[PDB]
């Protein structure tokens, strides 16, 4: 009942980072403190890693196991967006704002950062555990994918949105909003596929799947807290970002058909502000009136 409308929405949302000129951010970037620039680079690098694996591994593997040519076409399109559009856009931002050495250093930093490695290990592990014709392993990977789309990106998205909302780094911010618009529909779509599998189960099996989903969310959440503190303490925003990731965790649960898990909190209003023609021959009668 939904794939065709998602197909149409995904293809109509198609974009490339080159559509957005980035040289306009040069001055507001220059004006940020060293702490702010550091957090910003690292935040986008963490996002780049997530999209790299979502494009290389997550979306293609889910596409392989989901039945139906139209469902596969949507998932293939989403996969392309992840690595050919989203992951690449971050390099466009980096290449504009930062010198090569700072770019090299931040990519080295992703490799050695323990929270980023842990979250990649956990998510990709679940993708690679999918067994052919085994719907339960597929469900588990789809939960992981929804958590990546609708929860894990948000510790990263906070900062570009926070600046966009203050009228700073607005070209980079425009790119990020386009990425976010895509991930929102990706999270909903994968969520609907996960619910399909969940709804086939006995009540006993469903109870276990909810346990899996909640245990996984809590494990990812605890790691994300440490990641958030590590990045945001130097810019004074860790508590604010934490509220934002809890907000989005609830959206991820809802995408999976589950009740919200965290209590509602006031999000920084700045971040909320951050959101050929047919041819006929001429007759002799067309020359007279």
């Amino acid at each position: 009942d939904f794939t065709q409308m998602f197909y149409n929405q995904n293809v109509k949302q198609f974009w490339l980072p080159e559509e957005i000129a980035l040289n306009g951010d040069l001055l507001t970037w220059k004006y940020l403190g060293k702490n702010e620039q550091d957090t910003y680079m690292k935040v986008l690098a963490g996002l780049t890693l997530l999209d790299t694996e979502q494009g290389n591994t997550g979306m293609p593997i889910v596409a392989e196991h989901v039945d139906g040519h139209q469902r596969k076409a949507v998932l293939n399109f989403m996969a392309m967006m992840e690595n050919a559009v989203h992951a690449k856009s971050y390099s466009n931002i980096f290449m504009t704002l930062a010198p090569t050495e700072t770019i090299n250093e931040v990519f080295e930093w992703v490799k050695q950062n323990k929270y980023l490695q842990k979250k990649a290990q956990m998510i990709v592990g679940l993708y690679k555990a999918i067994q052919k014709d085994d719907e339960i392993s597929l469900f588990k990977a789809m939960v992981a994918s929804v958590y990546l789309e609708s929860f894990l990106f948000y510790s990263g998205f906070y900062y570009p949105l926070y600046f966009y909302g203050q009228g700073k780094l607005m070209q980079s911010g425009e790119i990020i909003n386009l990425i976010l618009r895509d991930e929102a529909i990706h999270g909903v779509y994968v969520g609907l596929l996960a619910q399909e599998i969940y709804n086939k189960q006995t009540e006993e099996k469903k109870a276990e799947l909810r346990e899996f989903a909640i245990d996984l969310l809590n494990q990812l959440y605890e790691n994300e807290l440490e990641y958030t503190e590590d990045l945001y303490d130097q810019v004074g925003l860790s508590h604010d970002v934490k509220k934002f990731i809890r907000y989005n965790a609830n959206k991820a649960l809802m995408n999976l058909g589950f009740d919200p898990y965290f209590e509602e909190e006031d999000i920084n209003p700045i971040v909320l502000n951050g959101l050929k023609a047919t041819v006929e021959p001429l007759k002799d009668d067309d020359f007279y009136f």
Partner: protein
């Protein structure tokens, strides 16, 4: 999102099944309560403001020095006494984003609407305080609007030229081509749109110094001009805009047209160079009879006859060209060429169409020259003489290059004030002043023709707005009756003002004695046909205003015979792109494209309803695409019969209609006397 933008977007939100048009007014208030007043620089008195603007190189000292400070203060007080309020948010937004003077840092507003109007009036009057107050009352009543160059730049030291329509004749030589490129660059630097006639240039495969197959044709010249216009782009502010016109009997006409095809290669297609095609009546006759036509090599014709192909009447010269063995020509199918024109206009809106004989059968200055091409907006139609730019240390033969002076009457505001005569005469005086104060030191033929011809273009706008707010359909015969009467009065008072200026200054335009004004032929249709309204509704619209009769036209003809006419050309209807927003008017005499237009500024959306749009006149504000293009052609021809120059006439087509329909509209325009066709905008 700012408060005024929310109030503007609340228009589309329907209450009781109706658009909240009145909310737009509230938006304006917000746009002034929250933004404009906060970012407007205020001074203790006008003396301090004028001193700050003059000292900081914002204004010019010369035009302000012609008045005492008391007179300038009185003019400003007259401007502010109207208490003018922008009726829509987009009017104020467009003025304060495009025309209001801002500081060098572009964060503060130095000029209000009244300040800009007062400065333009003081510039117009050239030292006459009463004339300046008359101009202030004209512009604050929004009866007359100087063009974007004049309105934006009048009285400003950091400014471009007040003229932005330039027509250049290019002679068939490398020296002339290089000079044309240079002049195009210099005029684009001044901020003007440049149109070049390429018909005199010899086609591809012609001889240079008696070596065969040497000429690159007009397409290489178009590539050079396109590069020149890309380079000269108003100091990196606007994209350099240029137009190239070629006669349809030029052999390069296909390659010319091929420059606008999407499939054209990078060495063929020109992207920033608009193209227009001049279509003589002979081509239309050949297409009508399905006889195969001939496209001629211009240099062979020049060698055989001593004159350029576009300098002689093709109606009487075509058979002689065809029968002449020394004239080289190529066989073409005129109907295929017409279909190609229609297809290209469907794809990209190009080329502009100039019906040469439609222009020249009513041209008053055929003795000086026949109108061979039009401007970038395809509404300037004037006599031009090519210049012979010789080698270095050799005297050039300077010809006439067209550069007319733009200004538009607001038909709604003019007619509701019952001031057709006063507005037309004051606009003519302002256009004469701007033409006299224009001095271009890098375009010799443009300067010479400005000094000699003294040609101005007085246009009109808000025709569809006025008709819709008066319960008249744009396609109705009553609308055409009103256009006929209104533009006949405009022509009458423009001719009267031109003759009065000629009598006062004791001089006419150069070669006026050979014009149809001097011989009285121009007034023939005016001394025999009565142009009073034939409908009671239109007559009641014209109530309170004297409508010139045949006796009045005879008196005007005698006055012109006795005193002459100061302007070679007076009236031309320009598109009026952005000034129509500030004046809260529909663009030009064209019908409206949309009832409410959606625009994206920055990352915000904005909504502009057409002026005076409401539930009662929603049906009368018919969109242009929904209209019958034949009736639009009829209205434009009705207006054109009273306009000496052309009218920027854009075709509005649906995606359903084919190239046959476009060709039919073009042929009906040719039949009805339409001089130029501007664009083919497909919905």
């Amino acid at each position: 999102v700012p408060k005024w933008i929310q109030l503007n977007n609340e228009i589309m939100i329907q209450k009781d099944g109706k658009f909240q048009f009145d909310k737009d007014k509230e938006a304006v208030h917000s746009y002034f309560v929250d933004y404009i007043n906060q970012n407007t620089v205020f001074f203790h008195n006008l003396k301090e403001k004028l001193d700050y603007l003059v000292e900081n190189q914002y204004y010019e000292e010369e035009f302000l020095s012609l008045y005492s400070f008391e007179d300038i203060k009185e003019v400003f007080k007259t401007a502010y006494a109207k208490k003018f309020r922008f009726p829509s948010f987009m009017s104020a937004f467009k003025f304060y984003n495009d025309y209001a003077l801002k500081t060098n840092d572009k964060k503060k507003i130095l000029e209000r609407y009244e300040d800009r109007i007062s400065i333009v009036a003081l510039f117009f009057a050239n030292g006459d305080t009463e004339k300046a107050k008359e101009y202030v009352n004209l512009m604050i009543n929004q009866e007359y609007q100087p063009s974007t160059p004049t309105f934006l730049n009048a009285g400003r030291k950091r400014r471009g030229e007040l003229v932005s329509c330039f027509l250049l004749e290019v002679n068939d030589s490398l020296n002339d081509i290089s000079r044309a490129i240079d002049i195009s660059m210099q005029l684009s630097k001044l901020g003007g749109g440049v149109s070049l006639n390429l018909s005199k240039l010899r086609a591809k495969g012609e001889a240079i110094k008696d070596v065969e197959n040497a000429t690159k044709g007009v397409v290489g010249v178009m590539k050079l001009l396109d590069n020149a216009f890309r380079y000269a782009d108003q100091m990196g502010q606007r994209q350099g805009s240029g137009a190239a016109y070629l006669n349809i009997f030029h052999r390069d006409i296909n390659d010319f047209l091929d420059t606008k095809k999407i499939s054209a290669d990078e060495d063929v297609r020109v992207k920033t160079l608009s193209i227009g095609v001049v279509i003589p009546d002979k081509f239309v006759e050949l297409a009508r009879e399905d006889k195969a036509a001939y496209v001629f090599y211009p240099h062979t014709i020049y060698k055989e006859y001593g004159q350029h192909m576009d300098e002689m009447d093709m109606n009487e010269m075509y058979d002689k060209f065809v029968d002449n063995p020394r004239v080289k020509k190529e066989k073409i199918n005129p109907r295929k060429l017409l279909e190609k024109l229609a297809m290209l206009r469907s794809e990209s809106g190009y080329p502009y169409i100039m019906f040469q004989d439609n222009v020249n059968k009513v041209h008053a200055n055929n003795h000086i020259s026949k109108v061979k091409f039009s401007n970038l907006c395809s509404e300037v139609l004037q006599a031009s003489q090519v210049s012979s730019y010789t080698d270095y240390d050799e005297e050039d033969e300077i010809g006439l290059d067209i550069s007319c002076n733009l200004g538009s009457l607001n038909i709604l505001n003019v007619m509701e004030h019952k001031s057709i005569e006063k507005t037309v005469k004051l606009a003519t005086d302002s256009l004469t002043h701007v033409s006299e104060t224009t001095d271009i030191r890098n375009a010799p033929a443009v300067r010479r023709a400005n000094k000699a011809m003294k040609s101005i273009g007085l246009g009109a706008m808000n025709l569809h707005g006025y008709l819709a707010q008066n319960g008249i359909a744009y396609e109705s015969p009553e609308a055409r009756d009103f256009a006929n009467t209104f533009f006949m009065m405009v022509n009458f008072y423009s001719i009267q003002r031109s003759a009065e200026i000629a009598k006062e200054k004791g001089e006419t335009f150069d070669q006026y004695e050979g014009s149809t004004y001097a011989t009285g032929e121009y007034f023939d249709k005016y001394v025999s046909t009565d142009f009073s309204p034939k409908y009671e509704k239109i007559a009641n619209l014209f109530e309170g205003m004297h409508i010139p009769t045949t006796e009045d036209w005879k008196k005007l003809k005698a006055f012109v015979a006795e005193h002459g006419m100061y302007h070679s050309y007076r009236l031309c209807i320009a598109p009026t792109g952005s000034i129509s927003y500030v004046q809260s008017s529909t663009a030009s005499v064209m019908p409206i494209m949309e009832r409410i237009e959606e625009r994206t500024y920055g990352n915000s959306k904005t909504y502009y309803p057409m002026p005076g749009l409401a539930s009662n006149n929603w049906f009368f504000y018919k969109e242009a695409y929904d209209m019958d293009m034949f009736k639009v052609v009829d209205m434009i021809a009705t207006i054109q019969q009273h306009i000496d120059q052309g009218i920027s006439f854009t075709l509005f087509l649906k995606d359903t209609m084919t190239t046959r329909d476009l060709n039919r509209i073009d042929l009906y325009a040719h039949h009805r006397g339409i001089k130029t066709i501007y664009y083919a905008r497909t919905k």
